[PDB]
RNA sequence: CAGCCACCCGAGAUUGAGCAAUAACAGGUCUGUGAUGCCCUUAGAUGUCCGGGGCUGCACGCGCGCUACACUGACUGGCUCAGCGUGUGCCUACCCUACGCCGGCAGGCGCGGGUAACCCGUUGAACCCCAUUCGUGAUGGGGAUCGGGGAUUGCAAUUAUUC
RNA sequence: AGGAGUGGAGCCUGCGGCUUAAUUUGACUCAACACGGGAAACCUCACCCGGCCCGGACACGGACAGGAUUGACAGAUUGAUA
């Protein structure tokens, strides 16, 4: 069928956006009807903790923060082209998946 | 250390069949992770490997509530001679090139 | 005098009714314990208290019954036993009484020496 | 802290003592008009136990280890 | 008017199973004096009621200066 | 009778079976996200894990 | 088998931490510097950087296969999907871990601690780094412990 | 001059944090350390085992908040609206919440909506625009102290810790 | 200038005196005392009792190949189901 989605989940914005731009350019090069980069709301996990190992001193809380980002791109194409365009030397540290409707 | 002989025999068997091995630290567990369905409680497993390391044939290695085993040529010869293993079995990673 | 009865129903009359209808006069928590279901930890202790009752000499209190965990009441079969309950080093002597129904036996056990009233210390005035 | 001193009672308790025959003769015996080993011990009817399992015929009860059946004589 | 028993305060009464209502002086305080029954059972609740302390586990370490002058 | 001798209390509320996985310890544990580490090792590994202060 | 993305991310970070801890406890004698992870569709490779490649390899290439089986058996991943490479660092001068281990193993072998610190400072400054500091603290002369510093170049301690 | 004070314009004419230097404290942490040295160790132990055993024990004061003192509001409801986020499991059993009914309450059973901004949820939360009393109060607020009824993970909730 | 309004007056983990077997301590101005990310029956439990395996591998001596633990109901009983 012509209902194919690709999922790129990562933590850094630069590598993920470069990968998304590369994929969208490659899928534009071949005459494909491709949906643009859909930006799922980034989720940041907040962890306020004790700094000192033993409770002593002042109450200083380390606000550790991790933000993760997700992009979804839909496209109507043969799946063989999807596989051939996935292995385009993707960036390390980004998780890419293929989803069927 | 009072544990069935088949337990130690199978421990040696799997150690030789894999060459290397590990020991997990827990007493709330029922048995060993890779020895599940074999009623081999991990307590006797850590007893086994601590006896083996105290015997002076495996160098201890520990990280994050886990023990890593080593393989020495003297240890290989000792295990083969004591278990009467055939002199043709080799460590697992040397198989399949 | 005026004979005390548990909510109008006495020991023999508690025996007459089934336990499920006995729960209504009972209290909760000792109602949920039966309602969910009963299990072990009441087999060997009940056995030995029955034996201490059986082997008792005539018209005398039965032999000591040794416990650590403070039991509860769900049927008066245990009533009429003298129990040493562990407090941490010694055993507390309690004789079961027919006015204790619908209440835990843990309320009749102690773990601490009663406090003392003395004089103020050195570093306590500020 | 001090020494806990778990020595109020029992000056020195040791492990359990078990004494065994050098070669058990109470298991099989003569005097049954048989030239083979004669059966005085009760044979376990359970499949999970067998003729090599000797439920100790003491003054009371049968002691097995896996099923622990009991027979009354009165 | 067939008002259920649980709405009342004397639901599941002591001595006898009672669910009716009787509002009168001189007996209501004796019903309030329900600790004496448990006082005779010398339970932990009974001892705590003897000392006039909050039996529901309230911390009485040094607090509670009211009512003693 | 070994079953009655050891672990006569099934713990479906325990925390030591899944305690800190760096060193065998429970004090200062976080149970979020399956990390199962103490505060000391959590802060000694947050950069390696992927957490970083930004505010 | 699968879990949400936040939990998988923290689990992958935990696995990276475990890997680095085990390696730095094992191969620091071989001038171990660092580790990295690459993930391909249904495959995971882990690469290492260390100064002495021939020493970190060992004999018959046995250590790499042994350690790989160790991590494969440790982390319960599908077997045959883990492979460990053999790479050397760009330079041992601009890497803090490598020089820290060099100072460590100069200290263990028996040598005046300040001679070793001076040597590591000289080695850093001939490597071309813009600056460094090394602090050696503990009991050097006597029973008291005094933290002891060495700085060269310029170092920034604030901001992004 | 470096700048400061006003005005036009402009979204903003000082948004808020994170990091944060010399050199030090005999500050704390040997009860995170499988980072630990040297004395105490080497079984009449200095642990997971029953959890049995306790800071939920009391003659006063210091030490971080809420209810309160009302006609600045308790008070019948008419109501129209949030943000941050953990959320059904390679030993991770513990998950947030709709259809029908029951019961004041703890909950129940059939599939259950949840790999996510699809599910919670157009998060129908706090005050107030009104609806009986109080119309100037020790009470209906202060339920802070003692009775009795229920369920969901609990081998056990007694010193009712939990609703 | 003052504003939530402080300690004020019941009920907080918390500290300090607290007998008892131990109410354990570590941490005394800001830079301790809702701190040890401490709302504890159980993992927060260190401390008071009785059992659990010795987690004893080299030297050297024992029945020196049959040495000795799990063997639900009654009996030896600080568990009778350790």
UniProtKB/Swiss-Prot annotation, chain A:
Chief localization: cytoplasm
Parts of the chain that traverse the membrane = none
| GO molecular function term, any single one | RNA binding
- Phosphoserine is found on 77
Q: Where N6-acetyllysine occurs, residue numbers?
A: 18, 59
GO cellular component, alphabetical, reads: cytoplasm; cytosol; cytosolic ribosome; cytosolic small ribosomal subunit; extracellular exosome; membrane; nucleoplasm; synapse
Question: Could you give a single Gene Ontology term from the biological process aspect?
Answer: translation
Tell me, how does this one assemble?
A: Component of the 40S small ribosomal subunit.
- Which purpose does this protein serve, as stated in its record? Component of the small ribosomal subunit. The ribosome is a large ribonucleoprotein complex responsible for the synthesis of proteins in the cell.
What family does this chain come from, according to its entry?
Answer: Belongs to the universal ribosomal protein uS10 family.
What protein does this entry describe?
Small ribosomal subunit protein uS10
Organism equals Homo sapiens
State which stretch of the full-length protein is shown: 17 to 117 of 119
From Swiss-Prot, chain B:
| Residues found modified as Phosphotyrosine | 12
Q: How does it assemble?
A: Component of the small ribosomal subunit. The methylated form interacts with NPM1.
Q: Name one GO molecular function term.
A: RNA binding
Q: Please state what the protein is called.
A: Small ribosomal subunit protein eS10
Q: What does this protein do?
A: Component of the 40S ribosomal subunit. The ribosome is a large ribonucleoprotein complex responsible for the synthesis of proteins in the cell.
Q: Name the GO terms of the biological process aspect.
A: cytoplasmic translation; translation
Cellular location(s): Cytoplasm; Nucleus, Nucleolus
Q: Quote the disease note of the record.
A: Diamond-Blackfan anemia 9: A form of Diamond-Blackfan anemia, a congenital non-regenerative hypoplastic anemia that usually presents early in infancy. Diamond-Blackfan anemia is characterized by a moderate to severe macrocytic anemia, erythroblastopenia, and an increased risk of malignancy. 30 to 40% of Diamond-Blackfan anemia patients present with short stature and congenital anomalies, the most frequent being craniofacial (Pierre-Robin syndrome and cleft palate), thumb and urogenital anomalies.
Family assignment? Belongs to the eukaryotic ribosomal protein eS10 family.
Q: Which gene encodes it?
A: RPS10
Look up the domain of life of the source. Eukaryota
From Swiss-Prot, chain D:
- N6-acetyllysine modified-residue sites: 27, 36
What the entry says about post-translational processing? Monoubiquitinated at Lys-30 and Lys-36 by RNF25 in response to ribosome collisions (ribosome stalling): ubiquitination promotes subsequent activation of RNF14, leading to EEF1A1 ubiquitination and degradation and rescue of stalled ribosomes. Deubiquitination at Lys-36 by USP16 is required for maturation of the 40S ribosomal complex.
Give the transmembrane ranges. Answer: none
Known consequence of changing residue 36 to R?
A: Abolished monoubiquitination by RNF25, leading to impaired ability to rescue stalled ribosomes. Abolished deubiquitination by USP16, without affecting maturation of the 40S ribosomal complex
Which residue stretches belong to region Disordered? 1-18
UniProt zinc finger (C4-type) residues: 44-67
Which positions are linked by Glycyl lysine isopeptide (Lys-Gly) (interchain with G-Cter in ubiquitin)?
A: 30, 36
- Judging by the UniProt lineage, the source's domain of life is Eukaryota
The listed locations are: Cytoplasm; Nucleus, Nucleolus
Function (record text): Component of the 40S subunit of the ribosome. Part of the small subunit (SSU) processome, first precursor of the small eukaryotic ribosomal subunit. During the assembly of the SSU processome in the nucleolus, many ribosome biogenesis factors, an RNA chaperone and ribosomal proteins associate with the nascent pre-rRNA and work in concert to generate RNA folding, modifications, rearrangements and cleavage as well as targeted degradation of pre-ribosomal RNA by the RNA exosome.
Q: How does it assemble?
A: Part of the 40S ribosomal subunit. Part of the small subunit (SSU) processome, composed of more than 70 proteins and the RNA chaperone small nucleolar RNA (snoRNA) U3.
Q: Which species expresses this protein natively? A: Homo sapiens
From Swiss-Prot, chain F:
Disease per UniProt entry = Diamond-Blackfan anemia 13: A form of Diamond-Blackfan anemia, a congenital non-regenerative hypoplastic anemia that usually presents early in infancy. Diamond-Blackfan anemia is characterized by a moderate to severe macrocytic anemia, erythroblastopenia, and an increased risk of malignancy. 30 to 40% of Diamond-Blackfan anemia patients present with short stature and congenital anomalies, the most frequent being craniofacial (Pierre-Robin syndrome and cleft palate), thumb and urogenital anomalies.
Q: Which residues carry this modification: Phosphoserine?
A: 8
GO cellular component annotations of the record = cytoplasm; cytoplasmic side of rough endoplasmic reticulum membrane; cytosol; cytosolic small ribosomal subunit; extracellular exosome; focal adhesion; nucleoplasm; ribosome
| Binding partners and assembly | Component of the 40S small ribosomal subunit.
Which keywords appear in this protein's UniProt record, sorted alphabetically? Acetylation, Cytoplasm, Diamond-Blackfan anemia, Disease variant, Endoplasmic reticulum, Metal-binding, Methylation, Phosphoprotein, Ribonucleoprotein, Ribosomal protein, Zinc
One MF term in GO for this entry? zinc ion binding
**Annotated organism of origin:** Homo sapiens
What residues does Zn(2+) bind to? 20, 23, 38, 41
Q: What's a single GO BP term from this record?
A: cytoplasmic translation
Functional note = Component of the small ribosomal subunit. The ribosome is a large ribonucleoprotein complex responsible for the synthesis of proteins in the cell.
Q: According to the UniProt entry, which residues carry Omega-N-methylarginine?
A: 11
Residues recorded with modification N6-acetyllysine: 47
User: What's the protein here called?
Assistant: Small ribosomal subunit protein uS14
């Amino acid at each position: 069928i012509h209902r194919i989605r690709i999922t790129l989940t990562s933590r850094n914005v630069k590598s993920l956006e470069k990968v998304c731009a590369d994929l969208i350019r490659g899928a534009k090069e071949k005459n494909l009807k491709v949906k643009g980069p859909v930006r799922m709301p980034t989720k940041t996990l907040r962890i306020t903790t004790r700094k000192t190992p033993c409770g002593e001193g002042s109450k200083t809380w380390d606000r550790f923060q991790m933000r993760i980002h997700k992009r979804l791109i839909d496209l109507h194409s043969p799946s063989e082209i999807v596989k051939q365009i996935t292995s385009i030397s993707i960036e390390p540290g980004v998780e890419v998946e293929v989803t069927i409707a | 250390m009072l544990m069935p002989k088949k337990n130690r025999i199978a421990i040696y068997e799997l150690l030789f069949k894999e060459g290397v091995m590990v020991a997990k630290k827990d007493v709330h567990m029922p048995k060993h992770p890779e020895l599940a369905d074999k009623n081999v409680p991990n307590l006797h497993v850590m007893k086994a490997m601590q006896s083996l390391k105290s015997r002076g044939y495996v160098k201890e290695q520990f990280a994050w509530r886990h023990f890593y085993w080593y393989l020495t040529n003297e240890g290989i010869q000792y295990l083969r001679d004591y278990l009467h293993l055939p002199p043709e079995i080799v460590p697992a990673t040397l198989r399949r090139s | 005098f005026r004979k005390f009865t548990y909510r109008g129903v006495d020991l023999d009359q508690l025996l007459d009714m089934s336990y499920e209808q006995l729960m209504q006069l009972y209290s909760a928590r000792q109602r949920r314990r039966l309602n969910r279901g009963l299990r072990r930890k009441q087999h060997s202790l009940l056995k030995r208290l029955r034996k201490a009752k059986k082997e008792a000499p005539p018209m005398e209190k039965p032999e000591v019954v040794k416990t650590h965990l403070r039991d509860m009441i769900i049927l008066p079969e245990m009533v009429g036993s003298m129990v040493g309950v562990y407090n941490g080093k010694t055993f507390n002597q309690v004789e079961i009484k027919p006015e204790m129904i619908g209440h835990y036996l843990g309320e009749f056990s102690i773990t601490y020496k009663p406090v003392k009233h003395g004089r103020p210390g050195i570093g306590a005035t500020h | 802290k001090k020494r806990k001193k778990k020595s109020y009672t029992t000056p020195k308790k040791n492990k359990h003592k078990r004494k065994k025959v050098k070669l058990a003769v109470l298991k099989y015996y003569k005097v049954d008009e048989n030239g083979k080993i004669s059966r005085l011990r009760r044979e376990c009817p359970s499949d999970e136990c067998g003729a090599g399992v000797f439920m100790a015929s003491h003054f009371d009860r049968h002691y097995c280890g896996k099923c622990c059946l009991t027979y009354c004589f009165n | 008017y067939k008002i259920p028993d649980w709405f009342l305060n004397r639901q599941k009464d002591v001595k006898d199973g009672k669910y009716s209502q009787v509002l009168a002086n001189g007996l209501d305080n004796k019903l309030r004096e329900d600790l004496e029954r448990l006082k005779k059972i010398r339970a932990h609740r009974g001892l705590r009621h003897f000392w006039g302390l909050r039996v529901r586990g309230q911390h009485t370490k040094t607090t509670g200066r009211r009512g003693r002058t | 009778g070994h079953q009655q001798l050891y672990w006569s209390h099934p713990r479906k509320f325990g925390q030591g079976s899944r305690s800190c996985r760096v060193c065998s310890n429970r004090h200062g544990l976080i149970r979020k996200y399956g990390l199962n580490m103490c505060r000391q090792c959590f802060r000694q590994y947050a950069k390696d894990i992927g957490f970083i202060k930004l505010d | 088998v699968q879990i949400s993305k936040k939990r998988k991310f923290v689990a992958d970070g935990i696995f990276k931490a475990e890997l680095n801890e085990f390696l730095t406890r094992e191969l620091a004698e071989d001038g171990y510097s660092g580790v990295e992870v690459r993930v391909t569709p249904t495959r995971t490779e882990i690469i290492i950087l260390a100064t002495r490649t021939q020493n970190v390899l060992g004999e018959k290439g046995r250590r790499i296969r042994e350690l790989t089986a160790v991590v494969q058996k440790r982390f319960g991943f599908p077997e045959g999907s883990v492979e460990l490479y053999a790479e050397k660092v760009a330079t041992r001068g601009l890497c803090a871990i490598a020089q820290a281990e060099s100072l460590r193993y100069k200290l263990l072998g028996g040598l005046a601690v300040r001679r070793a610190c001076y040597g590591v400072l000289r080695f850093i400054m001939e490597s071309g780094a813009k600056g460094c500091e090394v602090v050696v603290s503990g009991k050097l002369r006597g029973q008291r412990a005094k933290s002891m510093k060495f700085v060269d170049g310029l170092m920034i301690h604030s901001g992004d």
